[PDB]
Amino acid sequence: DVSFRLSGADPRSYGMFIKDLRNALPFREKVYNIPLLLPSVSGAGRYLLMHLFNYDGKTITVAVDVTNVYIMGYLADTTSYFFNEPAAELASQYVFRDARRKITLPYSGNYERLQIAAGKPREKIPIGLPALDSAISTLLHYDSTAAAGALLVLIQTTAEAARFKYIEQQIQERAYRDEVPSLATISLENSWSGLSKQIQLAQGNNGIFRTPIVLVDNKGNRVQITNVTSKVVTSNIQLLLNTRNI
Ligand SMILES: Nc1ncnc2c1ncn2[C@H]1C[C@H](O)[C@@H](COP(=O)(O)O)O1
Numbered sequence: 001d002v003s004f005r006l007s008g009a010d011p012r013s014y015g016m017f018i019k020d021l022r023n024a025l026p027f028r029e030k031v032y033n034i035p036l037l038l039p040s041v042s043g044a045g046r047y048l049l050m051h052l053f054n055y056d057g058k059t060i061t062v063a064v065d066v067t068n069v070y071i072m073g074y075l076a077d078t079t080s081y082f083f084n085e086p087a088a089e090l091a092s093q094y095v096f097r098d099a100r101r102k103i104t105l106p107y108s109g110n111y112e113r114l115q116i117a118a119g120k121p122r123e124k125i126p127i128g129l130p131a132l133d134s135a136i137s138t139l140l141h142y143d144s145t146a147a148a149g150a151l152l153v154l155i156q157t158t159a160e161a162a163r164f165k166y167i168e169q170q171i172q173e174r175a176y177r178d179e180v181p182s183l184a185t186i187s188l189e190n191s192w193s194g195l196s197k198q199i200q201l202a203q204g205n206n207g208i209f210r211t212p213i214v215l216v217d218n219k220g221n222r223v224q225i226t227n228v229t230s231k232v233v234t235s236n237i238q239l240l241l242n243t244r245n246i
Contacts, residue, residue, distance in 0.1 A: 003051040004158075006133045011172035014129060021162045022238055024048045025066045031200055032207070032228050034237055037067050039244035044094040047072065050158060054136040062154065063095045068241055069159040071109060071151070075099060076140045081147070083109035106144050109151070111189070117148035122189075125152055127181050128174025132157045156181065156189065164188045166218060166236050187216035188236070195225070195232065196241035202228050 002024050004017035025048065027035035050062040061075040065087065072091035073082035080096035082088040085108045092102055107117040115121045125131075131153045138150035161168040170185050181189075191213055198209040207228035215232060217223040225232055 001049045001051060003053070004132075005053045005057075006055050006129060006136070007053065007057060009129055009175065011175050014172055014175065015168065018158075018161045018168045021048075021050065021064075021158060025069065025162075025239060031203055031240055032233060034199065034233070034240050036200075036240045037069075037242050037245075039067070039242045041066055047091055047095050049095070052132070052136050052154075052158075054133050054140075056137075058136065058140055060136055060139050061096070062158070063091055064159065065091070068245055069162055069239065071155055071159060073105075074139060079103060079142065081105055081139070081142070083107065085109060103142060105147065107148060109155075111152070111155075114148045114152050114155075117145065118152055119145070120149065122152055122156070122181060122186060124180060125149055126174075126178035127153055127156050127185075128171060128176075128178035129157075130176065131174070131178040156185070160185075160189050160192075163192050163239050164236050165238055182218075183216040183220055184218050188232075191215055192237075193241055193246055195237055197243060197246050198225070199228065199233055199237070199240055200243045 002020040026038055029036045046065055048064040048066050050064060051059055052062060053059045063072045065072055072088040073080060075096045078100035080099040080102045082092050082104055084104050107113045135150035135153040138146045157171050161171050167185055167188060170182055194213050198211060198213055201210045202208060209226050213225040215223050215225060
């Protein structure tokens with residue numbers, strides 16, 4: 001398991017939690033010095049538990065698929081909550097089995113669906129550590145519309161920060177003041193599967209992308225990623241989604 005306490009949190013302690021989350025995900029191989037997530041994990045070991053505590057010490061436990069860093073669902077007191085998708089249904093067989101009832105949220109966990117359920121695209125929802133405090137407070141007690149926004153904040157501040165060092169640093173900048181994600185943040189979140197695919201294929205193509213990836217960089221500017229010496233591959237990406245799961 002990994003934990004993050006918002007009470008007393010600072011950029012350093014958030015950075016330690018994201019390091020904890022990345023290190024809980026198993027890998028057998030690195031490709032260009034980046035951990036390659038596993039094709040597959042049978043049974044209960046597939047799911048990592050993240051214990052998150054709001055400013056007031058109230059807690060949720062979030063279940064995370066270790067092959068793709070996808071949040072499946074979460075435990076608040078005696079109620080489990082799962083996304084309306086087959087992989088979350090599967091997770092509910094292994095995690096949160098001492099729960100009084102199980103609510104299937106009325107949406108899948110993908111970004112397009114959560115955005116429709118929340119009524120706002122990610123482009124317009126402030127992110128940061130205070131936002132994660134609010135998200136944890138929202139999820140303690142069922143509210144499906146409120147929970148869509150809260151889940152968009154939870155995913156970006158945990159899973160997306162684990163996947164990209166730049167996103168971790170953007171949340172550190174937002175330790176005490178929320179701000180809509182940067183253009184580079186939304187670009188990287190949208191591009192993780194594509195970059196993961198092109199980095200694995202570059203093994204066999206002399207570190208050259210078979211299909212170049214269009215991103216936004218830290219200065220707001222277009223950058224075309226054509227090969228593995230790019231800063232996105234050498235510094236930024238921290239985990240690779242396995243080609244088998246693309
Ligand atoms: N539930 C959940 N958990 C973890 N990560 C998530 C989740 N939903 C979306 N995302 C992340 C993961 C995808 O690689 C990416 C989708 O971006 P896009 O280009 O918009 O499809 O953002």
